[PDB]
């Protein structure tokens, strides 16, 4: 790997610099290098990893949606034939997106998840596994579509089971996991009622635990609770 000659600490330092410079591809490459050193990741390091790839794949997903919409229009009644270019370029972006997802899933499988024993790390990584299979599912159209969806579901479900046993209802990792699993239900699994039930129960159980929290923890938790509420307002 091109980062094999750089110190772990230097990779982390440069990931933080890249973030400040909004250079998220660089940030992701630095954090990939840090993971490949083979040591477990601290809480701060896990979040650098997730921030970096979330931004990279987020831009790819937005580009894919633009191109897929152009492509769908070209296949409407009365649309002039324009050749293979739209499909080719949508395919190019799609392939790069899948490559990023595969890279993340590879890091999780070699060997972040198997070494993660604390709830905060294990739930975090299993949420990531669910998220990146969900991104694969968004672009999937072939024979593997159902297996991709079930891989997302299975990872989210393992993370939910651990989070409910090991974390309080206001824990921000637990809350963000539930938010994204509810999006999975609504957007991927064709299960809007499950999505709505999960978001509401998650919100209500967190609300009832806020009284235990400091001011700073209260701010962290209510921020994600508001995202649950925003989705419920969109979906109902």
């Amino acid at each position: 790997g091109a980062m094999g000659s750089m110190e772990r600490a230097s990779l982390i330092q440069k990931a933080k610099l890249a973030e400040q410079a909004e250079r998220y591809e660089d940030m992701a490459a630095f954090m990939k290098g840090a993971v490949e050193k083979g040591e477990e990741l601290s809480c701060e390091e896990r979040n650098l990893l997730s921030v970096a790839y979330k931004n990279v794949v987020g831009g790819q997903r937005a580009a894919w949606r633009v191109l897929s919409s152009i492509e769908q229009k070209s296949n409407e009644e009365g649309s002039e034939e324009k050749g293979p270019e739209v499909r080719e370029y949508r395919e190019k972006v799609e392939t790069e997106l899948q490559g990023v997802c595969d890279t993340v899933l590879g890091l999780l499988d070699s060997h972040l998840i198997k070494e993660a024993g604390d709830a905060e790390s294990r739930v975090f990584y299993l949420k990531m596994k669910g998220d990146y299979y969900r991104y694969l599912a968004e672009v999937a159209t072939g024979d593997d579509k159902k297996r991709i969806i079930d891989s997302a579901r299975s990872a989210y479900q393992e993370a939910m089971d651990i989070s409910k046993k090991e974390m309080p209802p206001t824990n921000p990792i637990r809350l963000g996991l539930a938010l994204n699993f509810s999006v999975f239900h609504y957007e991927i699994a064709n299960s809007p009622e499950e999505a709505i039930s999960l978001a509401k129960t998650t919100f209500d159980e967190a609300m009832a635990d806020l009284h235990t929290l400091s001011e700073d923890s209260y701010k962290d938790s209510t921020l994600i609770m508001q995202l649950l509420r925003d989705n419920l307002t969109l979906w109902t």
Binding site: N180, V183, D230
Partner: peptide
């Protein structure tokens, strides 16, 4: 769009 985090 759906909100995720």
């Amino acid at each position: 769009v759906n909100l995720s985090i």
